[PDB]
Amino acid sequence: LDKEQVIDNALILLNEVGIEGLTTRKLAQKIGVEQPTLYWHVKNKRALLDALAETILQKHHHHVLPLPNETWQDFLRNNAKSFRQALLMYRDGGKIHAGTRPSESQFETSEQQLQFLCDAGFSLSQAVYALSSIAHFTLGSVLETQEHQESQKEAYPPLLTQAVAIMDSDNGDAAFLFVLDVMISGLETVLKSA
Amino acid sequence: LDKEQVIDNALILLNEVGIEGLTTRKLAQKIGVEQPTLYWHVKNKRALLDALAETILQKHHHHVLPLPNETWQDFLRNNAKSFRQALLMYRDGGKIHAGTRPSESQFETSEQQLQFLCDAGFSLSQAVYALSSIAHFTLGSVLETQEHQESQKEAYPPLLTQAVAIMDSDNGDAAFLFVLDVMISGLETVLKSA
Ligand SMILES: [Cl-]
Ligand SMILES: [Cl-]
Structure with missing residues (x-):
């Protein structure tokens, strides 16, 4: 055993x-x-x-690390997609992940993530906040997806009817992708002022 | 009763x-x-x-609505702060909120939120994604805060030691604020291409 x-x-x-x-x-x-x-x-x-x-x-x-051909933008993009898919693999995956501190096995890759963002020109704080952002958004996105599904059963206005369809029709995929790109644009603007 | x-x-x-x-x-x-x-x-x-x-x-x-003096940016900023604080009021507030569909009482303000973002020049999809973003990030941020606190008790590398201090020292406040502003910058860039 x-x-x-x-x-x-x-x-x-x-x-x-x-x-x-x-x-x-x-x-x-x-x-x-x-x-x-x-x-x-x-x-x-x-x-x-x-x-x-x-x-x-x-x-x-x-x-968990940038590929050799990857910009920081590409990296954050693919890291977040990889994370989301991993959280979605298991029942209650989002709840499982929430509140866990980094694991001794993860120390070195987490350290290189931070260093990599610093070398891109982010301050350490910004690097930490940038990684925290992906993680929190992905987590909230996944938790909503998973929780919405679990509460299955037991008259919206016009724009809200379409908003509900838009979020539910693909289990949040398009919305995840859009916001990820928005977060990456916003971070580019952070770098651009220094 | x-x-x-x-x-x-x-x-x-x-x-x-x-x-x-x-x-x-x-x-x-x-x-x-x-x-x-x-x-x-x-x-x-x-x-x-x-x-x-x-x-x-x-x-x-x-x-839940823009004040008369408010830009869309100000509105999203204050809406998100208001949401976060409301989720933080109650034990397991994030878990409570997760997976709830909009309430009949909320229909009209949710409709005006969407209309307001459309009038700012967002497409309906973008408006929906923009509101979903705030909600998901705030939710993930709060869930982490709350869950980290609940798992109280039962050797990090250098950058990671500082990253942990930076997130824990104020229960995620600074990181929430930074990312909120990043999401708002990124959305401005979305509007700027049309
Ligand atoms: Cl063993
Ligand atoms: Cl009653």
Whole structure:
């Protein structure tokens, strides 16, 4: 019984029951071990949630550094798309990611992200805010998508009728893409004054 | 026993136990009524959550229309600040807001928001995306703030150490403000090409 196996099962369970319903007792039962055996790998729910958030990004969020051919704009664009897709992979992915601090495994790439934005001419603060922006917008976008879907069932004015169709018709994709490009334009304007 | 009273109690309960722990059975017990009596006002948890999200905005989110002296930029700026503060009023405010569709009470102001952005020279799509952006970023920002706080307890590289301090030292305020202004600059660039 190794960690990888424990977490692989936890991810399957997460899709079966969601974040609220996910407990260690439930994980222990699914794996077919006693709870004190599981304890060694996952001490509690908070520790489980942390491990899931980190593993989901390890498994699915592959655009964490700029490619050699990439501008900072391209990088932020593809990083955000990669993040969004990773959050969308798993049930309650947005709730899973929320409130997790960077993982020891992520330290070096997160450091190079910050350095890379600094070399582009952002101050450190601005770099941090720029990365925080993508993350928060992507997270809010995903949480809305996921939550809207989960509340399925139990007379709008004209412009609002079209606005609802426009957001729902593609689960927020076009709106995500537009705003991402808007955030990137706005950041270019930040660089342009120095 | 009227709706206002039911919901006032529910908001107090929400702060006491959080979104997960909030149930109708618990609400009924707090009010001191039988569950079938409560049923008439709130049919289930999903209906309760909807009513809380709507009432929290009614009670605390007052910058929903432009003031007479306001540019569209000023408006989006103050609308977003007003929203953020309203989401921050209540425990799990971000989770409460997520996945709620506009309320019949909100129809007319939401319609005027959209019209106002159209009159500024945004296409309807762009208007919808622009409003969605604020909402999603504010929501992700708030959810991170709230969730980070809730996971209190149970060696960063140099730039990352400073980035963590920078985000945590004011619970995301400076970063929210910067990105809001970045989103507004980027939207100005959208208008500038037509
Ligand atoms: Cl192991
Ligand atoms: Cl009533």
